[PDB]
Structure 1
């Protein structure tokens, strides 16, 4: 700190949202970036795009990790992505709704959807702590026969990830291009099987986002030293396309099934 103002804070703007950062980031990209071509073969209805709504950096969860619950491999976040994020606005009964968040408002009236994603992880520690986080992404991981084994931080180091050095207080961004078995994901619980058929698919489960402890959070032994630290996430969409226009209530949203 050498100025009347503290110092210069870098700025990142998208739509009508402005994010400030002060340090050098840790970055990675889940897969090769590309422009889709086979999505046009999936739907004859024109794909609508709402960039001012979807390209907006939106605030996700805050998760609080303490010294007493910070062990190697501790999962601060284990969420189906982008399902958990898009469905983060629930009612009294933990039933999601796409009706209040402007970024998610197109999900309510469309049956099929696709986009690339970016995730920012913000931690604001003081000058006197030490620790390390790893945020990683696994494409459709929950469907793999060894999913729980891939949860170990040693395994996360090999999938696309970014690191947060609490000793440096760096921000971090993880780019996640769209890759799925189909050129579109489903927004809601539709086309389940019948008496004989079982075609069941989760809405918006492109993969699993992890946030885990690489090196446990440590603090001064002093009493008035913060033994806690909040971890905040931000998400946005790059190439958001929506198709299959429907009434917002033609299909329902179920209570989401959690991960182990």
Structure 2
């Protein structure tokens, strides 16, 4: 801090959201970015795009991690993705609903979709705590015959990931191009596969979080996650109530 206000912050505006970032990010891309071409072969109806709705960034979770519980490779986030982000809004019975959130409003009226994602993670420690986090993404990880051996952070160091150093307190951005076994994903439970299950997003604890022995120091720290879609195309307009959502299955 040398100015009256601390310093010059940097701004990342998309649609009507604006995200301040004071540090140099840490970026990676889960595979090569491309322009979809065979997706026109799958559906005769025009694919609808909602750039004002879906391009917008969205706050997803806040996960709390404490000094007393940081192993090596303790999972803060282990989620089917985008399934967990899109179905984040639950009613009293924990049944998701695509109606409230304006990014997810088109998932309500369509059957199939396709889009690229960008997950961005934020940690705001003070200067005197030191740790380290890894956030990696595994394409259709849940369907893999050994999915539960790949959760060690030694395995995540290989799949596309970002690192968040808590001593430096940087941002991190993980771009995820759409890749899947079929040119679209289902938005609801139809034709009886889970909806919108493209992979698994992990957040592990690469180096455990450490603070000073002083009593008033923070023993905890927050992690926040923002997500946004990019080339989102929806197809197959139906009624909102023609299909149902059931409460999601969790990973082991």
Q: So what's the TM-score if we normalise by structure 1? A: 0.97
SS state of the match for residue 142, structure 2?
helix
SS state of the match for residue 23, structure 1?
coil
Deviations 1:169-206 (A, max 9, x none): 000000000000000000000011xxxxxxxx110000
Determine which of 229, 233, 240 is the counterpart of 1:241: 233
Deviations 1:96-139 (A, max 9, x none): 00000000000000000010000000000000000000000000
Mapped to 2, the partners of 1:253 and 1:51 lie a distance apart of 25
Structure 1: 5+ residue runs without aligned partners? 193-200
Mapped to 2, the partners of 1:258 and 1:76 lie a distance apart of 14
Once the two structures are TM-superposed, the CA of residue 23 in structure 1 deviates from its matched residue by 0.4
SS state of the match for residue 149, structure 2?
helix
SS state of the match for residue 76, structure 2?
strand
Deviations 1:219-245 (A, max 9, x none): 010000001000000000010000000
Mapped to 2, the partners of 1:244 and 1:108 lie a distance apart of 11
Once the two structures are TM-superposed, the CA of residue 2 in structure 1 deviates from its matched residue by 0.4
Mapped to 1, the partners of 2:10 and 2:159 lie a distance apart of 29
What is the CA RMSD across the aligned residues, in angstroms? Answer: 0.4
Mapped to 2, the partners of 1:177 and 1:234 lie a distance apart of 16
Once the two structures are TM-superposed, the CA of residue 25 in structure 1 deviates from its matched residue by 0.7
**Which residue in 2 is equivalent to 1:47?**
47
Mapped to 2, the partners of 1:214 and 1:2 lie a distance apart of 34
Mapped to 1, the partners of 2:135 and 2:151 lie a distance apart of 12
SS state of the match for residue 94, structure 1?
coil
Mapped to 1, the partners of 2:76 and 2:134 lie a distance apart of 10
Deviations 1:4-60 (A, max 9, x none): 010000100000000000001111000000000011010001100000100000000
Mapped to 2, the partners of 1:68 and 1:43 lie a distance apart of 52
Mapped to 2, the partners of 1:252 and 1:38 lie a distance apart of 29
Mapped to 1, the partners of 2:51 and 2:65 lie a distance apart of 34
Mapped to 2, the partners of 1:21 and 1:82 lie a distance apart of 24
Aligned residues: 252
Once the two structures are TM-superposed, the CA of residue 213 in structure 1 deviates from its matched residue by 0.2
List 4+ stretches of structure 1 deviating above 2 A.
Answer: none
Once the two structures are TM-superposed, the CA of residue 207 in structure 1 deviates from its matched residue by 0.1
Once the two structures are TM-superposed, the CA of residue 255 in structure 1 deviates from its matched residue by 0.6
SS state of the match for residue 150, structure 1?
coil
Mapped to 1, the partners of 2:239 and 2:43 lie a distance apart of 18
Mapped to 2, the partners of 1:180 and 1:202 lie a distance apart of 13
**Which residue in 2 is equivalent to 1:137?**
137
**Which residue in 1 is equivalent to 2:64?**
64
Structure 2: 5+ residue runs without aligned partners? none
SS state of the match for residue 11, structure 2?
strand
Q: So what's the TM-score if we normalise by structure 2? A: 1.00
Mapped to 1, the partners of 2:72 and 2:140 lie a distance apart of 24
Mapped to 1, the partners of 2:247 and 2:28 lie a distance apart of 32
